[model samples]
Target chain A: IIGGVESIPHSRPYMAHLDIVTEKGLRVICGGFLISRQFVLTAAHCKGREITVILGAHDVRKRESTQQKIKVEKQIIHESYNSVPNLHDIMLLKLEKKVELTPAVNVVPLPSPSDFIHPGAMCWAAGWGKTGVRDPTSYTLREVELRIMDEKACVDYRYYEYKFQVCVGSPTTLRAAFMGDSGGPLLCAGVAHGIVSYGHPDAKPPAIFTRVSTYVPWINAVIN
Target chain B: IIGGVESIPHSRPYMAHLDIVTEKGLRVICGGFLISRQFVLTAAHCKGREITVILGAHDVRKRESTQQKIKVEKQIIHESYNSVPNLHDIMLLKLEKKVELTPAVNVVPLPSPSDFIHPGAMCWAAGWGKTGVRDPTSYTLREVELRIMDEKACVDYRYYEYKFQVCVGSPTTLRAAFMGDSGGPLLCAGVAHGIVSYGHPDAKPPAIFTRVSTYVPWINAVIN
Candidate 1:
């Protein structure tokens, strides 16, 4: 949500707030979204000893009535994430109990295995990332519209993942996600098509995301 | 221009990039705007032993063909600023020679003495300010559209400057002008309605501005 406007309260109902107690006990945060009642999806790099997944959150600072906090029953990191790192930068957190469906709490649909979001398509990315350079992470849910980038126009593809790791956003504009927003979804046409991965350290445009269609088979295996 | 998008090159032809040789001999920067051939308006705090006013600047790093670099002849700080401080935080720099105007270099129209911009009006602010918390000041001119805020919605007004100093922008939103943009203009209806004075140190809104209309008489007397 860096350089973005705050979305309407409870508007992004599928958004998840991950509070991680690091291995050394330091608290860290990441953004994720609900895909099913029992699990929340995020990036694999988001690791911790004890994780708390918060659903239906708008303002992270306040204890809003609509928010539902769930402790992690088990954390699942992408199997091949260690070697091919960023291409497999994804994870799923199993909740202690199934999340109750409410007007302010629901899951976003996942992209099908054969589905692909074409270049130039407008997509939405939402999170509670830092709103401005010096300011801390936003307390409220914020969203930015991005364009799915063409591979031919992408800056680099050295250790390319092709469609497995999707590229989305402006290479020329100032709009893109940043540090605290990792693991959030890149929703194209209401379907969670990608998971926030990494980007330019300076928060420039054209962020990389884990293309969800490429991981649909693995996700289906886990859920089944 | 923090939390804003890059403005079209030379789109804001009146913008002036101030490169200052401070009292300690270190280089620093601030933004200003040209209102007449020989004068540039800025903030009083943008002091220096020597100052270079660059007109027709879009990107500060490159020496674009359209740029006109001129040494400042003198800077006139508001006399009452020492007592009233932020309310009188305004300054004008006289150029060594009258600038040769081109399509890329021009003056912005000033507001009339009786002119007033009402609350809820949308105004534009542009600068080469830092785009993010850790990033440096942008090399390119950037702009943000901000709303003229209502006094009733203002958070604090203790050392109130009232109408002499106007308040603009959302108190609830994160958008605002930051440190390096001190002398830039807040353009309402193509008129320089306000000067970028100061805001909450963290770049929070609403930002306090020197009402251009209130200072119109003083500006007229000085240039006369």
Candidate 2:
């Protein structure tokens, strides 16, 4: 399942989702976010030798949908990105061509230089991801309103925060992200506050994200 | 399982194979095509709120794959769409903003204004969808190439089709869209010829599509 953003009229015209094409012409399951003209933010594990990035996709199963194909120029994994403990498993793909930004294909704002987001702050998250355990599959991208979580709650929930991890949504566990939302975004107001790195299996209490403040240095080093 | 355009690699990018969420709190699944700047082609039931459309998504689990977003302004379901029978299940959603045309996200040209797509002609389908029954719960939107089949062959196998239906893929029993591929696309050459509306429960022969041409009049009425 994937995540798509739908507004009041119940239409999702703009949203970011992911797919993986395997060696056998099969697309692997992955998630991603449009962050810049020539860059995308996704999980480091989503990378493969044959990976190709696509933009302006109206449909995935059809060839008629417009597409701007870009070979990944470089894949930068956070030094802390690891598979085992699933630490900072984040990465960036530099596109060979600089894409023109529009409403559909645009970059999201990064966390502000002076923004000090705290736990329990209301934020938004989006992705072409899963919802409930038995819910078939989401057709378009979906969005949910969530609140940032306090550190205390996340620490108490062993499955959530380990190291380099940030928690979002309330302790009541009412708001959260589900599967297929990894490596997307955790936005505080309109600014991207974090990345979906990890969370619990059913994603109960709160979805986990990679702290943007902690990774600012890493992002700057890679992009600059 | 869910139908989608993106999936993650390496990492166990979980499948939104069911209704799921993205890291940014967006929800997505299934695949759709584009018909106009303000209109996106998708399954009627696929529409939702604050929905964002991500192009070139290859995985459902990895968060760092190529992707973008579109905000849906309105979702226009086929006047004849029926949930139980699942017939005439096509829909068009207007984007809050017009998408910029690019190689990554270009508009899928409508079947040449008057082209009459025939049966048995080769057609292709792709998605970051499930890989058959066994791997139902995993998120790996993969693609499989299929050939179009005649309506006679489709009906001979107990498939469903109305005047609004077109058939795609081979007549071979196991080569058609299976359980989780509802509301996906069926491509002819490189153009979106139809949508995966239904198929045999036994998974035999080819799948049925909601013919795009048959609904052109209806589509134009809603979008224009």
Candidate 3:
């Protein structure tokens, strides 16, 4: 099985995976993904060994069912993950055991090698994050659908999305993920299109993500 | 008695010092002080002549108040005002007539030729702008106390105190001036230590003010 219980399976076909935790009168949720049988991709700064993977766990506040609770074996942050403009923030996590794929915990496929997601392509991204204006962080994991846009158009506004990065989502709506939701997936066309990066943490528009395809060689080397 | 309202002498000391209206109808309220008989010291961007300036009025919002209203005849913005990072944002305003000062309507004295207000001095600032977290803009005037901090401390915290600008205010507490409270005086030991300058507009900390002593020569040359 992908994981034990699927949270919002019907809302979106692909789920941007993450980790949830609570123990010793302490609970802090973090973001990551099961990208391969034994490796997961996440942001480099989020590589604390104290974190545990909670596959198929959706309702963070409820702390419901989980498939496998695995400890991190090793974390490999990209050598260039400097905290400035934050150019290369990618990281890989090696779990203690191979994750068994199931309907609720299957790895989402990346887009075809030659097929690029054009700008204005309708896509969806899901995350458990703050819901609305002035709304506190949600206990239940939430997801949002967004669109992928041409790199040029995204750059016109930001001028920061380099070749290694991709831009997705709308600019006017406050719909993107917020704190504790970094390193999640940017889904497009039922495939893993990008990795969630930075945007206005409090804003909904222009939820940027790192271009997964652009960095495929580096990632495949790590995963395979 | 103050020049404009000799009949109403007692209430004149409480008048608001400046007003600013952004292009988006964002009416900013700030404070200012008369530096010369015909000029006011405030943030350069806040200098709009046709915008309202009331003298000898305690309650600035009341339309029926007997304050002297004057249109701005001219504004002299500091040539080095940089929008990015917002440095050197001082300006001088030329009023329609030479203001006749009284005890209630006189200029706040600047630093002495050889003496300066030491850092960590308890300072006071007053404005009719928004106060308290989540409070909307207010038209009625208000004032708050602050403290002068060492310039080195501010710079160490990534605060770029510009050459043409000086910095003042508490380093820790959230007590600076509000959006409509720019251009007001920061008083220390009964003397004007600084003028309200640009700050983190949405921040919780009280606003930062531009130092008065550093720009004394410029103020004298423009208004004298």
Candidate 4:
């Protein structure tokens, strides 16, 4: 299932869409997840001044009953966030108002400090990214199951360092999250374990993410 | 060139063909190299009681002027050779007589302890391997230039460990040594850097090799 498939409506209730509005128009640049009533987490590299968070919507193009769009009050990027090599690539957006919980609107539970996903463990990643090669971003939420690859192997390839990063994908096939999926949550057994960080367009087996468990202390400092 | 191409007759002077004879018939099972006048270096996994060493031959079916067929006097396998996990998969075939070196038949220099090939370096492998997916072993000696990949990546994939093994192939393409190419030399700057050991038949990348530099001491003890 790593190649990606359509998700049932309201199945992934915590999914949040981050739209960056410039003078030209509004464009969905990245993804996020509602961690609490007033904060949504995403990637720090998705920097923008005017940002909007769309929640409880399975299809981004349609106005659904469960949809809620909220303006961001403040963006808190990791202090040490660097885009060149993509270190500490994470951020949190404080919503102007607390989101109202509905059937299609909920919060995702973060992994405990001691909870870690072992190599070869199966996990899921859902996003409104490109569905196929040369294909446009999907209107419906798309999900895929990927296996966690060894971190040392990724480090050796210069793809990621084990500090705060992890990689997940089919070891032999071209299965990964593409453009527009950045900052999305990587779910393992209903717990958010990773955040979609970067990927190579031409390489097989992509989907590098920020290991959420490694940032537990940082998240605690920010939220508390 | 990594996809493989036919070599000019005897252009690769150090190439050695390993032929095995059984109850059925004679077949070229693997490939090797001429390290000295009396010994041919190959893989221990290419085990056989009756073996022949063919030197200076390009085409296996034809009798060429530069070709010399010699009976193997003894097959010396590594003391700790194991086929299941392919550890210490190296061997030396002592010839009945010293080979008469010609323009088409000569010795290849072994790598010294410090002459290590770094990862991502380009190297060449030549043998009489299968030329096409459905084709038989090539009649003429075939060669390809492959890039050495990170050893940790290979180990993580369960392909090969870094103990005595190194992997060489196109990291982004389907370039590799196929059937009949095992035990062949991986040449770097005209020096024998690796020995073709084993590969996945169904996988795109073709061959993994025993790092020749790792066994320099053992090879010196045997040949001395």
Candidate 5:
């Protein structure tokens, strides 16, 4: 986030840190959220051979007793994502084993497919991406308040399509998501309303996110 | 321009430096090209109280012997620009007096209404705007090679419209036009084929420019 604050430790139990080994070599990072005992949701563009999810961690730089690392058994990338890049940028990860629920590790609720998030509604997003233009991956989980903006804000910029992508932040917004923050949830009213997508490399606010409500049906089809 | 180099002093004889006095207060900067002896073509978004066009200067910071500064008699912005922002981002500035043509200050030729520039065709754009992401307005005229790109590059991103906004630069290119560079001409072959409009704040290439060919009829109607 452009102007985010470090989140309270274990405050977001559903938050998941993604570690992907590209062809089992290059380690890439992303953010995810637990949707079920063994299913974590993220973005399709975050492909990997050995994808793992670290749940209930605050500061990733230090080992925590509350943290639970689990290997990904399967990665279900959206079928049409490759054909239409930046569209349907969602994916489901099946954990190798079901996590034992605890106060520090749990699931987040999902909004129904018909759920509508009005423009101007304030939502919360968290990640471990750059805190500033020259900053690097954050050591601790940081969150910021992103106001849901009219679709025109994103579609008008020509970086995002008109459908299934929610525009968050405003030109007046001071906080924003940046690189390495992709796949995190946009939590609104205690439900996942959207998922981090893409923004300009400059990390300006009003970035694009995958609207979770639009993919509930497809998500159920995959997770079930 | 990003990753640009100082041009040979006065090599671009038609280059015009715009200094706009907003409400007769804040000084604004933009770029332009001389289309006729008394008419300088530019962008409508670059409005001002006392718009001055500085001609025949390479190093803008210095008092060069070949410089001529003239006030704008009228600023005829495109009729549709305000009605639909970013779509027809063009304007015509009638100078206070007809400039005396010389080797250091001449008018640039414009393409016909039907002329087409190929997608991969290499074009040239010059400006005194930022040369780096955090840099200020350049002290000298800088030029960069920009390759006109496919329409999908801009329109698909949703920032640029499908018509009249030519996409320049590539994802892999390093050079780009930043803020304070609007209204400059995109010279292709020997004619003004485009006008610098807007780009990402980061100055990444693949910026949008107003196509010159599509507005030739309007230009003829205004200048004649």
Candidate 6:
């Protein structure tokens, strides 16, 4: 489960699928997290009006008893967010009703103010994002272990470096985040340290993430 | 200075006078705080072209050895800030160069994320803003002690209730922030808990301030 494989059911309770209905039909727009009973944290760039949150679903093709579909009451996108690559790409979704806490549906704890994801730290990235350039979306939740890279490495790799972002994954491995994984959580020691923001096409390595610790105050101000 | 009086020299090191030169000539436009060697936290609504920061100065009419005039290199206003009353009215000014830390010039520590200024907690508000309804800006820095009021009290007084804002001052007392104190710091237990944002034109009590702790992430992101 640590290297781009199917994850066990209910293994990632905070995982959320942002299902968006377009003219083309229903599709998983992006991955999100259940930060609270009524809020789902994701990327601001993943915009849509007809959005539904699918929680506790392991397989996208099959219905499970633990799966719950909830309607979004409101969408709070970061006002500064621009679609010019990786910047303030974070957003919060307010659910119509408070989610009932269960083993398969739970909230993820946020990182403390002083808690930082140091370089070389092993972190997990999970989503139903495309596994390859030509492959369709993964049927089941796929997870991989990613390594948090230093700022220098990110800059040296020609990635756009922003103060509110963190770089993760290796340059030589296929463990990087791809399409559909945008807005997913980058977990470190059970806490969400980052949110999948952007990366190069062709499933390149060293994906960018919106640093969660940097926006804790903004998130708290909006939620509370 | 329980009510409002001239402040002691070098007593408030974090104080900053935002001097602006409009077509009307040079004047103290707003107040700010030295949050770091290169950053001064103020209000986003206080906009100006020729902005200069006057630090460690007790009187605006006279120059002092401890006083230093630094030009503002950049103004980073909260992107969500709209002049529509008291929501996300914070801004940070980047200095052209780092100031030499001295007894008369220092940084004010920000309140912790968990820290809260309870109702009835005594706090200090200092600025050169207008002293009376008809008076101009105070020639010297003025200091006043105000009591934090409950949100319900603010609502009862017809003030808009915003989670990002804190109501301060007494309902019966004459102590309150006036025009010129617009971007000043609200000090609680020596930590900056809020920023002077706006008040009624008649210098009414229970003035509103932009809660500092609510935007710590923004401040850190801009400063760092």
DockQ of each: 0.01, 0.03, 0.01, 0.01, 0.01, 0.01
Residue-by-residue lDDT tens digits, candidate 4, B5-81: 88878778988898775332223378999999999999987777588888989876677878989999989999988
Isolated chain B TM-score per model:
0.95, 0.76, 0.80, 0.93, 0.96, 0.94
**Which residue ranges in model 6 land beyond 4 Å of their true spot?**
A1-224, B22-28
Q: Could you give the CAPRI-style class of model 2?
A: incorrect
Runs in model 5 lying further than 4 Å from the true structure: A1-224
lDDT of each: 0.83, 0.60, 0.61, 0.82, 0.86, 0.83
Kindly list the per-residue Cα lDDT of model 2 for residues B27-123, writing each as its tens digit. Answer: 4466666666667676665655445565444453344334446666676788879877678879776777886654445566567547667765776
lDDT for position A10 in model 3: 25
Candidate 6 clash figure, as a count: 0
Per-residue lDDT for A85-200 in model 4, tens only? 88999998889999999889999999998998888888888888766555556778898888898876577765787768887776577678877788899999889999998876
Clashing pairs in 1: A133-B132, A133-B133, A134-B133
Compose the digit string of candidate 2's lDDT tens values, residues A1-224: 22224433212222345555544434454556667787788777666645566555544433423345566777788876667777777888787788766545667777644556787688777665566543433444556777776777677666554345677766454455666666667777777777777666665666667777666667767888
lDDT of 1 by residue, B103-204 (tens): 999999998998988988999999987664444577789888889876764545433466777777786667778767889999999999888888765667
Please give the distance, in angstroms, between residue B116's alpha carbon in candidate 1 and its true position after superposition.
Answer: 62
Say which candidate scores most in lDDT: 5
Against the true structure, candidate 3 reaches a TM-score of 0.45
After superposing candidate 1 on the true structure, give the runs of residues whose Cα lies further than 4 Å from its correct spot: A83-85, A155-159, B1-224
- Residue B103 miss distance in model 5 (angstroms): 1.1
Q: For residues A1-224, write the lDDT of model 5, one tens digit per residue.
A: 56989999998999999987666244568999999999999988788878889998998756788989999999999888854557889999999999989999999999988997889999999998767765556768999998998877877665676568888998785688876688999999889999998887677778889999888999998877
Show the lowest summed lDDT stretch of 10 residues, model 5 chain A.
Answer: A19-28
Between the candidate structures 1 and 4, which one is better when assessed by lDDT? 1
